[PDB]
Amino acid sequence: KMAFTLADRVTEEMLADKAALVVEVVEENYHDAPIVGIAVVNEHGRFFLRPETALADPQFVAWLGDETKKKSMFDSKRAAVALKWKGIELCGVSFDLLLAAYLLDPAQGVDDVAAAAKMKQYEAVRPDEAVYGKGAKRAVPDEPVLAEHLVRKAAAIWELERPFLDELRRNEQDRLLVELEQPLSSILAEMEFAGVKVDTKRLEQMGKELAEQLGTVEQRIYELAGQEFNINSPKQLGVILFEKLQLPVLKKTKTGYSTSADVLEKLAPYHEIVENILHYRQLGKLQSTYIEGLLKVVRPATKKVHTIFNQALTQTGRLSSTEPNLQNIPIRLEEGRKIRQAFVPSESDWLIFAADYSQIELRVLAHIAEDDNLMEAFRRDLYGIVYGISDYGLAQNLNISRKEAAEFIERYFESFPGVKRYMENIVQEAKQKGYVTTLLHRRRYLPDITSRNFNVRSFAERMAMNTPIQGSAADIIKKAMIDLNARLKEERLQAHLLLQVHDELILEAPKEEMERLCRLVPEVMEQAVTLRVPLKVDYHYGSTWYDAK
DNA sequence: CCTGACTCC
DNA sequence: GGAGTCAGG
Ligand SMILES: Nc1ccn([C@H]2CC[C@@H](COP(=O)(O)OP(=O)(O)OP(=O)(O)O)O2)c(=O)n1
């Protein structure tokens, strides 16, 4: 039971200075995607608008871009970007229910209005998947069924804003939402829409040469193996290694023999085929993911790739990057690192600028553990612990004796008693409170932390150790991003952000601005928050992302 | 569609 | 510790 007006045209009462707004983009990847419908809920009533009509209306477009007309939405970035592709600016977004839900509890995995409403027992709205359907059945339903959904979603947002803000305020997270995540969302929207330009000629040439080399390595493997098999099948590979060649089985998973990189490396003294296999799988991933996969999503006319930064997914407060993922482009082996030569500025006589925090997580450990020996070390400017590594895990990682690994860790805690203290204290806090928190009050709940089951419990305790560290770094670089764009905009530099990579920011700019960026960027990033230790940032620029080192 | 690869922070 | 994509099955 909910009345609404199926409008044939926009009226003045639709354009109030506060509204719940739904700009519906049904395709998961919203870049250049259709807007299938619009809904507005305000003091005056509920309205559905056809996008052809509304978006072609100069008064509705004006309202959309008016910062003083406040909108409450769910996933405003999706809307803001889809509107950019329609040549329309979205302003005045004051509340995002997606981001509010994420801050309240990231484990709920809220990705539609219905799921957010569930957190307040609000039931007068359907899940999106139930309206549109799954997979090949996915479709926009008949207008009256569509219109009712969009309106119900707007009505839900309208009624849920204050209950959500009230709870955020109770948790002291309202500023985290309004001053950080919400402004970050607009910045991410800008980055996504700008995209990153790709040198397809170079990428395609790399692909051709990689293909030849895969063939050569492939044949060499079959020769060493004494047989042809699918190297990309862990199962067939297992038979070759552990049955035909009779190499030792160092690890098994629930499906059979492990052929992990760690395991194969340890088998190098037994047979020279394992090294070749490792090489083959490296090359094949470069080809399948960073040449072919990347070329598939390049927009041919502009040669740009447009990632989507998921702001409400990770359990720690980090972003993730999808379709394509630009936060896992190779760098560690020169062979893969060369992929970065294909990422270039979007304008002639521009350069790529790259700035990275040095050891941000170990410094956060220092700051939050208040370890003197660790803080003193950073003031002189002089990881496994941070992930809760065992003696076993460390022995294996370093391929050394466990006794020696265990002694390394025991020594470590003896040497850093304040870190050892933090670890014990943060776990105890998690057990007492049921959640851990970050510098800017991001939380993660850990309902398993008192499980009687050793493995379940242990994993939870490790999360208690790590999340405040990783999450606090996420908080910092996010703050650094918001401040940076402000510092860029005032002094009207043309430079703009392209990418964030966890503890790194990647920009493009006219070559003329490099000197000013060498000053501005590292400063802003270091002055993002003030810790007990100093924040350090390294920076480079160059003709391509590769050269920015 | 899941698992186990390789990739980053 | 936190992520995404890919091929095989
Ligand atoms: N209503 C609030 C209050 C705080 N915060 C987040 C944003 C910044 C961070 C700092 O909190 P402050 O009040 O400025 O410092 P504090 O009180 O000393 O924080 P803490 O309780 O952790 O010591 O917390 C928030 O999101 N919403």
Coordinates of C-alpha atoms (C1' of nucleotides) and ligand atoms in Angstrom, one line a residue:
Chain A
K1 CA 0.0 0.0 0.0
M2 CA 1.8 3.1 -1.3
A3 CA 0.5 5.8 -3.7
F4 CA 2.7 7.5 -6.2
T5 CA 2.3 9.6 -9.3
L6 CA 3.4 8.2 -12.7
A7 CA 4.4 11.5 -14.1
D8 CA 4.4 12.3 -17.8
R9 CA 6.4 15.5 -17.1
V10 CA 8.3 17.3 -14.4
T11 CA 6.5 19.6 -12.0
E12 CA 7.7 22.1 -9.4
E13 CA 6.7 20.1 -6.4
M14 CA 9.1 17.3 -7.6
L15 CA 12.0 19.8 -7.2
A16 CA 11.9 20.4 -3.5
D17 CA 15.2 21.2 -1.6
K18 CA 15.2 17.8 0.0
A19 CA 14.3 14.5 -1.6
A20 CA 15.1 10.8 -1.7
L21 CA 16.2 10.2 -5.3
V22 CA 16.6 7.0 -7.3
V23 CA 18.4 7.1 -10.6
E24 CA 18.2 3.5 -11.6
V25 CA 21.1 1.8 -13.4
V26 CA 20.4 -1.9 -13.6
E27 CA 23.7 -3.1 -15.2
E28 CA 26.3 -4.0 -12.7
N29 CA 28.9 -2.0 -14.6
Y30 CA 27.4 1.4 -14.7
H31 CA 29.8 3.0 -17.1
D32 CA 27.9 4.3 -20.1
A33 CA 24.9 2.2 -18.9
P34 CA 21.2 3.0 -19.5
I35 CA 19.2 4.8 -16.8
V36 CA 16.0 2.9 -16.8
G37 CA 13.9 5.0 -14.5
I38 CA 13.9 7.8 -11.9
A39 CA 12.0 8.2 -8.6
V40 CA 11.7 11.1 -6.2
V41 CA 10.2 11.2 -2.7
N42 CA 9.8 14.4 -0.8
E43 CA 7.5 16.4 1.5
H44 CA 4.9 16.7 -1.3
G45 CA 4.7 13.1 -2.4
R46 CA 6.1 10.3 -4.5
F47 CA 6.9 10.5 -8.2
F48 CA 8.2 8.3 -10.9
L49 CA 9.8 9.9 -14.0
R50 CA 10.8 8.4 -17.4
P51 CA 14.5 9.2 -18.0
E52 CA 14.0 10.2 -21.6
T53 CA 11.6 12.9 -20.3
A54 CA 13.2 14.0 -17.1
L55 CA 16.9 14.0 -18.2
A56 CA 16.0 16.0 -21.3
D57 CA 14.2 18.6 -19.1
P58 CA 16.3 21.7 -18.4
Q59 CA 14.5 22.2 -15.0
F60 CA 15.1 18.7 -13.8
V61 CA 18.7 18.7 -14.9
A62 CA 19.1 22.0 -13.1
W63 CA 17.7 20.6 -9.9
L64 CA 20.1 17.6 -10.2
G65 CA 23.1 19.8 -10.4
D66 CA 22.0 22.2 -7.7
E67 CA 24.2 21.7 -4.6
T68 CA 21.5 23.4 -2.4
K69 CA 18.8 20.8 -3.3
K70 CA 19.7 18.0 -1.1
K71 CA 19.3 14.4 -2.1
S72 CA 19.3 11.2 -0.1
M73 CA 20.3 8.2 -2.2
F74 CA 21.6 4.6 -2.2
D75 CA 25.0 4.2 -4.0
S76 CA 25.1 7.8 -5.3
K77 CA 28.4 7.1 -7.1
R78 CA 26.7 4.7 -9.5
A79 CA 24.1 7.4 -10.2
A80 CA 26.7 10.2 -10.4
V81 CA 28.7 8.3 -13.0
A82 CA 25.8 7.0 -15.1
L83 CA 24.7 10.7 -15.2
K84 CA 28.2 11.8 -16.3
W85 CA 27.9 9.5 -19.2
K86 CA 24.6 11.1 -20.0
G87 CA 26.4 14.5 -19.8
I88 CA 24.6 15.6 -16.6
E89 CA 26.0 16.7 -13.2
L90 CA 24.7 15.4 -9.9
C91 CA 25.1 17.6 -6.8
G92 CA 23.7 17.9 -3.4
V93 CA 23.9 14.3 -2.3
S94 CA 23.8 14.6 1.5
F95 CA 23.0 11.0 2.5
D96 CA 24.1 7.7 1.0
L97 CA 22.3 4.7 2.6
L98 CA 24.8 2.3 1.1
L99 CA 27.7 3.9 2.8
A100 CA 25.8 4.4 6.0
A101 CA 25.0 0.7 6.1
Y102 CA 28.6 -0.2 5.3
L103 CA 30.0 1.8 8.2
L104 CA 27.4 0.4 10.6
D105 CA 28.4 -3.2 9.8
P106 CA 30.5 -4.1 6.7
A107 CA 29.8 -7.9 7.2
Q108 CA 26.2 -7.6 6.3
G109 CA 27.3 -7.1 2.7
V110 CA 24.6 -4.7 1.9
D111 CA 24.3 -4.1 -1.8
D112 CA 20.7 -3.1 -2.3
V113 CA 18.1 -1.0 -0.5
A114 CA 16.1 -4.0 0.7
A115 CA 19.2 -5.3 2.5
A116 CA 19.8 -1.9 4.2
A117 CA 16.2 -1.7 5.2
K118 CA 16.4 -5.2 6.8
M119 CA 18.8 -3.5 9.4
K120 CA 15.8 -1.5 10.6
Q121 CA 13.1 -4.1 10.1
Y122 CA 11.7 -1.9 7.2
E123 CA 9.9 -4.4 5.0
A124 CA 8.0 -2.3 2.4
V125 CA 10.5 -2.7 -0.4
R126 CA 11.7 -5.7 -2.5
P127 CA 15.3 -6.9 -3.2
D128 CA 16.5 -5.8 -6.7
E129 CA 17.3 -9.3 -7.7
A130 CA 13.7 -10.3 -7.2
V131 CA 12.4 -7.4 -9.4
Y132 CA 15.0 -7.8 -12.2
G133 CA 15.9 -11.5 -12.0
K134 CA 19.1 -13.5 -12.2
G135 CA 21.6 -14.0 -15.1
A136 CA 20.1 -14.4 -18.5
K137 CA 16.6 -13.9 -17.1
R138 CA 17.7 -10.4 -16.0
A139 CA 15.3 -7.7 -17.4
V140 CA 13.6 -4.4 -16.7
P141 CA 9.9 -5.3 -15.9
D142 CA 6.8 -3.6 -17.2
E143 CA 6.8 0.2 -16.3
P144 CA 4.2 0.0 -13.5
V145 CA 6.1 -2.8 -11.8
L146 CA 9.3 -0.9 -12.3
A147 CA 7.9 2.4 -11.2
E148 CA 6.5 0.9 -7.9
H149 CA 9.9 -0.6 -7.1
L150 CA 11.8 2.6 -7.7
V151 CA 9.3 4.6 -5.6
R152 CA 9.4 2.0 -2.8
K153 CA 13.2 2.3 -2.8
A154 CA 13.0 6.0 -2.6
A155 CA 10.4 5.8 0.1
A156 CA 12.7 3.4 2.1
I157 CA 15.6 5.8 1.7
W158 CA 13.4 8.7 2.9
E159 CA 12.2 6.8 6.0
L160 CA 15.6 5.2 6.8
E161 CA 17.9 8.3 6.7
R162 CA 17.3 9.4 10.3
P163 CA 17.3 6.0 11.9
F164 CA 20.6 5.3 10.2
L165 CA 22.1 8.7 11.0
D166 CA 20.9 8.4 14.6
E167 CA 22.7 5.1 15.0
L168 CA 25.9 6.4 13.3
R169 CA 25.9 9.3 15.8
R170 CA 25.4 6.9 18.7
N171 CA 28.5 5.0 17.4
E172 CA 30.4 8.3 16.8
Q173 CA 30.7 7.4 13.1
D174 CA 28.5 10.2 11.6
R175 CA 31.5 12.3 10.7
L176 CA 33.1 9.3 9.2
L177 CA 30.1 9.1 6.8
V178 CA 29.5 12.8 6.1
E179 CA 33.0 14.2 6.1
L180 CA 34.9 11.3 4.7
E181 CA 33.1 8.5 2.9
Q182 CA 30.5 10.7 1.2
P183 CA 33.0 13.2 -0.1
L184 CA 35.3 10.4 -1.2
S185 CA 32.5 8.9 -3.2
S186 CA 32.4 12.0 -5.5
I187 CA 36.1 11.9 -5.9
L188 CA 36.0 8.3 -6.9
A189 CA 33.3 9.1 -9.3
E190 CA 35.5 11.6 -10.9
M191 CA 38.4 9.2 -11.2
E192 CA 36.3 6.4 -12.7
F193 CA 34.8 8.7 -15.3
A194 CA 38.1 10.1 -16.3
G195 CA 39.5 6.7 -16.8
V196 CA 43.1 5.8 -17.6
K197 CA 44.4 5.9 -21.2
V198 CA 46.0 2.7 -22.7
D199 CA 48.7 2.3 -25.4
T200 CA 46.9 -0.5 -27.2
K201 CA 49.6 -0.7 -29.9
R202 CA 52.2 -1.5 -27.2
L203 CA 49.9 -3.8 -25.3
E204 CA 49.0 -5.7 -28.5
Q205 CA 52.7 -6.0 -29.5
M206 CA 53.5 -7.3 -26.0
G207 CA 50.7 -9.9 -26.4
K208 CA 52.1 -11.2 -29.7
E209 CA 55.6 -11.6 -28.2
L210 CA 54.2 -13.2 -25.0
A211 CA 52.3 -15.7 -27.1
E212 CA 55.5 -16.9 -28.8
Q213 CA 57.3 -17.2 -25.5
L214 CA 54.4 -19.2 -24.0
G215 CA 54.7 -21.6 -26.9
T216 CA 58.4 -22.0 -26.3
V217 CA 58.1 -22.5 -22.6
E218 CA 55.2 -24.8 -23.1
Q219 CA 57.1 -27.1 -25.4
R220 CA 60.1 -27.1 -23.1
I221 CA 57.8 -28.3 -20.2
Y222 CA 56.3 -31.1 -22.3
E223 CA 59.9 -32.2 -23.1
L224 CA 60.9 -32.2 -19.5
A225 CA 57.7 -33.9 -18.6
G226 CA 58.0 -36.6 -21.3
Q227 CA 54.4 -35.9 -22.2
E228 CA 51.8 -33.3 -23.2
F229 CA 49.3 -32.2 -20.6
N230 CA 47.3 -29.1 -19.6
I231 CA 49.8 -27.1 -17.5
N232 CA 46.9 -24.8 -16.5
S233 CA 45.1 -27.7 -14.8
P234 CA 46.4 -28.2 -11.2
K235 CA 44.8 -31.7 -11.4
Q236 CA 46.7 -32.9 -14.5
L237 CA 49.8 -31.1 -13.3
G238 CA 49.5 -33.0 -10.0
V239 CA 49.5 -36.3 -11.8
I240 CA 52.6 -35.4 -13.8
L241 CA 54.5 -34.1 -10.8
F242 CA 53.5 -36.5 -8.0
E243 CA 52.6 -39.6 -9.9
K244 CA 54.6 -39.7 -13.1
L245 CA 57.8 -37.9 -11.9
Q246 CA 57.3 -39.1 -8.3
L247 CA 58.2 -35.8 -6.6
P248 CA 57.5 -35.5 -2.9
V249 CA 54.0 -34.4 -1.8
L250 CA 54.5 -31.5 0.6
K251 CA 50.9 -30.3 0.8
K252 CA 47.4 -31.5 -0.1
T253 CA 44.2 -29.5 -0.3
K254 CA 40.6 -30.8 -0.1
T255 CA 40.7 -31.5 -3.9
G256 CA 44.2 -33.2 -4.1
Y257 CA 47.9 -32.4 -4.5
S258 CA 48.8 -28.8 -4.0
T259 CA 50.8 -27.2 -6.9
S260 CA 51.0 -23.8 -5.2
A261 CA 54.0 -21.6 -6.1
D262 CA 55.4 -22.1 -2.6
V263 CA 55.3 -25.8 -3.0
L264 CA 56.8 -25.8 -6.5
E265 CA 59.6 -23.6 -5.5
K266 CA 60.6 -26.1 -2.7
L267 CA 60.6 -28.9 -5.3
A268 CA 63.3 -27.1 -7.4
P269 CA 66.1 -29.4 -6.1
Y270 CA 64.3 -32.5 -7.4
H271 CA 63.5 -31.5 -11.0
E272 CA 64.0 -28.6 -13.3
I273 CA 60.4 -28.8 -14.7
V274 CA 58.9 -27.0 -11.7
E275 CA 60.8 -23.8 -12.4
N276 CA 59.6 -23.8 -16.0
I277 CA 56.0 -24.5 -14.8
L278 CA 56.2 -21.5 -12.5
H279 CA 57.4 -19.4 -15.4
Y280 CA 54.6 -20.7 -17.7
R281 CA 51.9 -19.8 -15.2
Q282 CA 53.3 -16.3 -14.7
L283 CA 53.4 -15.7 -18.5
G284 CA 49.9 -17.2 -18.9
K285 CA 48.4 -14.8 -16.3
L286 CA 50.1 -11.8 -17.9
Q287 CA 48.6 -12.9 -21.3
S288 CA 45.1 -13.9 -20.1
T289 CA 44.5 -11.1 -17.5
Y290 CA 46.8 -8.1 -18.3
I291 CA 46.9 -8.2 -22.1
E292 CA 43.7 -10.0 -23.3
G293 CA 41.6 -9.1 -20.3
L294 CA 42.7 -5.5 -20.3
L295 CA 42.2 -5.0 -24.1
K296 CA 38.7 -6.4 -23.8
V297 CA 37.6 -3.5 -21.6
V298 CA 39.4 -0.7 -23.3
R299 CA 36.9 1.7 -24.9
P300 CA 38.1 1.7 -28.5
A301 CA 37.4 5.3 -29.5
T302 CA 39.2 6.9 -26.5
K303 CA 41.5 4.0 -25.6
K304 CA 40.5 4.5 -22.0
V305 CA 39.8 2.0 -19.3
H306 CA 37.2 2.8 -16.6
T307 CA 37.5 0.8 -13.4
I308 CA 34.9 0.8 -10.7
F309 CA 36.1 1.4 -7.1
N310 CA 33.9 -0.5 -4.8
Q311 CA 33.7 1.6 -1.7
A312 CA 31.4 -0.6 0.4
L313 CA 32.8 -4.1 0.1
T314 CA 36.0 -4.8 2.1
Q315 CA 35.8 -5.7 5.7
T316 CA 38.6 -3.3 6.7
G317 CA 37.6 -0.1 5.0
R318 CA 39.8 -0.4 1.9
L319 CA 38.5 0.1 -1.6
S320 CA 38.5 -2.6 -4.2
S321 CA 38.8 -2.2 -8.0
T322 CA 36.9 -4.2 -10.6
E323 CA 36.4 -4.6 -14.4
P324 CA 39.2 -4.1 -14.7
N325 CA 41.1 -4.4 -11.4
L326 CA 43.7 -1.6 -11.6
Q327 CA 45.0 -2.3 -8.1
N328 CA 46.9 -5.5 -9.0
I329 CA 48.8 -4.5 -12.1
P330 CA 52.2 -6.3 -12.0
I331 CA 55.3 -4.6 -10.6
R332 CA 57.5 -7.2 -8.8
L333 CA 59.0 -9.0 -11.8
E334 CA 60.4 -6.8 -14.7
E335 CA 58.7 -9.1 -17.2
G336 CA 55.2 -8.3 -15.8
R337 CA 56.2 -4.8 -14.7
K338 CA 56.4 -3.8 -18.4
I339 CA 52.6 -3.9 -18.6
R340 CA 52.8 -0.5 -16.9
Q341 CA 54.4 1.0 -20.1
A342 CA 50.9 0.6 -21.6
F343 CA 49.3 3.0 -19.1
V344 CA 49.9 6.5 -20.3
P345 CA 48.6 10.1 -19.8
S346 CA 45.3 11.1 -21.5
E347 CA 46.8 14.2 -23.1
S348 CA 50.1 14.9 -25.0
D349 CA 52.8 16.5 -22.9
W350 CA 51.3 15.1 -19.7
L351 CA 53.1 12.8 -17.3
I352 CA 52.1 10.2 -14.7
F353 CA 52.8 11.0 -11.1
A354 CA 53.0 8.2 -8.4
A355 CA 53.2 8.7 -4.6
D356 CA 53.4 5.9 -2.0
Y357 CA 53.4 5.7 1.8
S358 CA 56.5 4.1 3.2
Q359 CA 55.6 1.3 5.7
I360 CA 52.3 2.9 6.7
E361 CA 51.0 -0.2 8.4
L362 CA 54.2 -0.8 10.5
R363 CA 54.0 2.9 11.6
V364 CA 50.4 2.5 12.6
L365 CA 51.4 -0.5 14.6
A366 CA 54.0 1.8 16.2
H367 CA 51.5 4.5 16.9
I368 CA 48.7 2.4 18.2
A369 CA 50.9 0.0 20.2
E370 CA 52.8 3.0 21.5
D371 CA 56.0 0.8 21.3
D372 CA 59.0 2.9 22.3
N373 CA 61.6 0.7 20.5
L374 CA 59.5 0.8 17.3
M375 CA 58.5 4.5 17.6
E376 CA 62.2 5.4 18.3
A377 CA 63.2 3.4 15.2
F378 CA 60.9 5.4 13.0
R379 CA 61.9 8.7 14.5
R380 CA 65.5 8.0 13.6
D381 CA 64.0 7.2 10.2
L382 CA 65.9 3.9 10.6
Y383 CA 54.8 -7.8 8.3
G384 CA 54.3 -11.4 9.3
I385 CA 53.7 -10.2 12.8
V386 CA 51.0 -7.9 11.4
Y387 CA 49.2 -10.9 9.8
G388 CA 49.7 -13.0 13.0
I389 CA 52.1 -15.3 11.4
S390 CA 53.1 -18.6 13.1
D391 CA 56.5 -20.2 13.4
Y392 CA 55.3 -22.7 10.9
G393 CA 54.1 -20.1 8.4
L394 CA 57.4 -18.2 8.7
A395 CA 59.6 -21.3 8.4
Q396 CA 57.8 -22.1 5.2
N397 CA 57.8 -18.6 3.8
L398 CA 61.5 -18.2 4.4
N399 CA 62.2 -21.9 3.8
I400 CA 64.1 -22.1 7.1
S401 CA 63.9 -24.3 10.2
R402 CA 60.8 -23.9 12.4
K403 CA 62.9 -23.9 15.5
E404 CA 64.7 -20.8 14.0
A405 CA 61.4 -19.4 12.8
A406 CA 59.8 -19.8 16.3
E407 CA 62.9 -18.2 17.8
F408 CA 62.7 -15.3 15.4
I409 CA 59.1 -14.6 16.5
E410 CA 59.9 -15.1 20.2
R411 CA 62.8 -12.8 19.9
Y412 CA 60.7 -10.2 18.1
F413 CA 58.1 -9.9 20.8
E414 CA 60.8 -9.8 23.5
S415 CA 62.4 -6.9 21.5
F416 CA 59.0 -5.1 20.9
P417 CA 57.1 -5.5 24.2
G418 CA 54.6 -2.8 23.4
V419 CA 53.6 -4.5 20.2
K420 CA 53.3 -7.8 22.0
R421 CA 51.2 -5.9 24.6
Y422 CA 49.0 -4.4 21.9
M423 CA 48.3 -7.8 20.4
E424 CA 47.2 -9.3 23.7
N425 CA 45.2 -6.2 24.6
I426 CA 43.4 -5.8 21.2
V427 CA 42.3 -9.4 21.3
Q428 CA 41.0 -9.0 24.8
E429 CA 39.1 -5.8 23.8
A430 CA 37.6 -7.7 20.9
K431 CA 36.3 -10.5 23.2
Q432 CA 35.0 -7.9 25.6
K433 CA 33.2 -5.6 23.1
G434 CA 32.6 -7.8 20.1
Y435 CA 34.2 -5.5 17.6
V436 CA 37.5 -3.6 17.0
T437 CA 37.8 0.0 15.7
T438 CA 40.1 2.2 13.6
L439 CA 41.6 5.6 14.0
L440 CA 38.5 7.3 12.5
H441 CA 36.1 5.0 14.2
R442 CA 35.5 2.4 11.5
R443 CA 34.4 -0.8 13.1
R444 CA 34.5 -4.5 12.3
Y445 CA 32.4 -6.9 14.4
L446 CA 33.9 -10.3 15.3
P447 CA 31.1 -12.5 16.6
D448 CA 33.4 -15.6 16.3
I449 CA 36.2 -14.4 18.5
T450 CA 35.1 -16.6 21.4
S451 CA 34.3 -19.7 19.4
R452 CA 35.4 -22.9 21.2
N453 CA 36.8 -24.0 17.8
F454 CA 40.5 -23.3 17.7
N455 CA 40.6 -22.5 13.9
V456 CA 37.5 -20.3 14.0
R457 CA 38.7 -18.5 17.1
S458 CA 42.3 -18.1 15.9
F459 CA 41.2 -16.5 12.6
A460 CA 39.0 -14.1 14.5
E461 CA 41.9 -13.1 16.8
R462 CA 44.1 -12.5 13.8
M463 CA 41.4 -10.2 12.4
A464 CA 41.4 -8.3 15.7
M465 CA 45.2 -7.8 15.4
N466 CA 45.2 -6.7 11.8
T467 CA 42.0 -4.8 11.1
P468 CA 42.7 -1.8 13.2
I469 CA 46.1 -1.5 11.4
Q470 CA 45.0 -2.0 7.8
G471 CA 41.7 -0.1 8.5
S472 CA 43.5 2.8 10.0
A473 CA 45.8 3.1 7.0
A474 CA 42.7 2.9 4.8
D475 CA 41.2 5.8 6.8
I476 CA 44.4 7.9 6.4
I477 CA 44.8 7.6 2.6
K478 CA 41.1 8.3 2.2
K479 CA 41.5 11.5 4.2
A480 CA 44.7 12.3 2.2
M481 CA 42.6 11.9 -1.0
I482 CA 39.9 14.4 0.0
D483 CA 42.5 17.0 1.2
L484 CA 44.6 16.5 -1.9
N485 CA 41.7 17.3 -4.3
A486 CA 40.9 20.4 -2.3
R487 CA 44.5 21.5 -2.4
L488 CA 44.6 20.8 -6.2
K489 CA 41.4 22.7 -6.8
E490 CA 42.2 25.9 -5.0
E491 CA 45.5 26.5 -6.8
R492 CA 43.7 25.4 -10.0
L493 CA 46.4 22.8 -11.1
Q494 CA 45.0 20.7 -14.0
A495 CA 46.4 17.6 -12.3
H496 CA 43.8 15.0 -11.3
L497 CA 43.7 11.6 -9.6
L498 CA 43.5 8.5 -11.7
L499 CA 44.0 5.6 -9.2
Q500 CA 44.4 4.7 -5.6
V501 CA 46.2 1.5 -4.7
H502 CA 45.8 1.0 -1.0
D503 CA 48.8 3.0 0.2
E504 CA 49.5 4.8 -3.2
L505 CA 48.0 7.6 -5.2
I506 CA 48.4 7.8 -9.0
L507 CA 47.8 11.1 -10.8
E508 CA 48.3 12.6 -14.3
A509 CA 49.2 16.2 -15.0
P510 CA 50.8 18.6 -17.5
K511 CA 54.6 18.3 -17.3
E512 CA 54.6 21.9 -16.2
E513 CA 53.2 20.9 -12.8
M514 CA 55.6 18.2 -11.8
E515 CA 57.6 20.5 -9.6
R516 CA 54.5 21.7 -7.8
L517 CA 53.2 18.2 -7.3
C518 CA 56.6 17.0 -5.9
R519 CA 55.8 19.5 -3.2
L520 CA 52.0 19.4 -2.8
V521 CA 51.2 15.7 -3.0
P522 CA 53.8 14.2 -0.5
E523 CA 53.0 17.0 1.9
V524 CA 49.2 16.6 1.9
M525 CA 49.5 12.8 2.2
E526 CA 51.9 13.1 5.2
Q527 CA 49.8 15.7 6.9
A528 CA 46.6 13.7 6.5
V529 CA 46.7 12.7 10.1
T530 CA 49.2 13.3 12.9
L531 CA 50.6 10.2 14.6
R532 CA 53.1 9.6 17.4
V533 CA 55.5 8.7 14.6
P534 CA 56.1 10.5 11.3
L535 CA 54.4 9.7 8.0
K536 CA 56.8 9.2 5.0
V537 CA 55.9 9.4 1.3
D538 CA 58.0 8.6 -1.8
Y539 CA 57.2 9.9 -5.2
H540 CA 58.1 9.6 -8.9
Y541 CA 56.8 10.7 -12.3
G542 CA 57.4 9.8 -15.9
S543 CA 56.1 9.3 -19.4
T544 CA 54.2 6.1 -18.4
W545 CA 53.1 4.4 -15.2
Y546 CA 56.2 2.2 -15.7
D547 CA 58.6 5.1 -15.8
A548 CA 57.0 6.7 -12.7
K549 CA 59.4 4.9 -10.5
Chain B
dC1 C1' 29.5 -21.8 -10.2
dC2 C1' 33.9 -23.4 -7.1
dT3 C1' 38.7 -24.2 -6.7
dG4 C1' 43.2 -23.1 -7.1
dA5 C1' 46.2 -20.6 -9.7
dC6 C1' 48.7 -15.5 -10.2
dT7 C1' 48.4 -10.6 -9.3
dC8 C1' 48.6 -6.3 -5.9
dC9 C1' 48.8 -3.7 -1.2
Chain C
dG1 C1' 45.9 -9.7 6.8
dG2 C1' 42.9 -7.5 2.8
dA3 C1' 41.3 -7.9 -2.3
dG4 C1' 39.9 -9.6 -8.3
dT5 C1' 40.4 -12.4 -12.4
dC6 C1' 41.3 -16.2 -14.9
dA7 C1' 41.1 -21.4 -16.7
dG8 C1' 39.6 -25.9 -15.6
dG9 C1' 36.5 -28.8 -14.2
Ligands
LIG1 N1 30.5 12.0 15.9 C1 31.6 11.5 15.4 C2 32.8 11.6 16.1 C3 34.0 11.1 15.7 N2 34.0 10.5 14.5 C4 35.3 9.9 13.9 C5 35.8 11.0 12.9 C6 37.2 11.4 13.4 C7 37.5 10.5 14.6 C8 38.1 11.4 15.7 O1 37.2 11.6 16.8 P1 37.4 13.0 17.7 O2 36.2 13.2 18.5 O3 37.7 14.2 16.8 O4 38.7 12.6 18.6 P2 38.5 11.7 19.9 O5 37.3 12.1 20.6 O6 39.7 11.8 20.8 O7 38.4 10.2 19.3 P3 38.7 9.0 20.2 O8 37.4 8.7 21.0 O9 39.0 7.8 19.3 O10 39.8 9.3 21.1 O11 36.3 9.8 14.9 C9 32.9 10.3 13.7 O12 32.9 9.7 12.7 N3 31.7 10.8 14.2

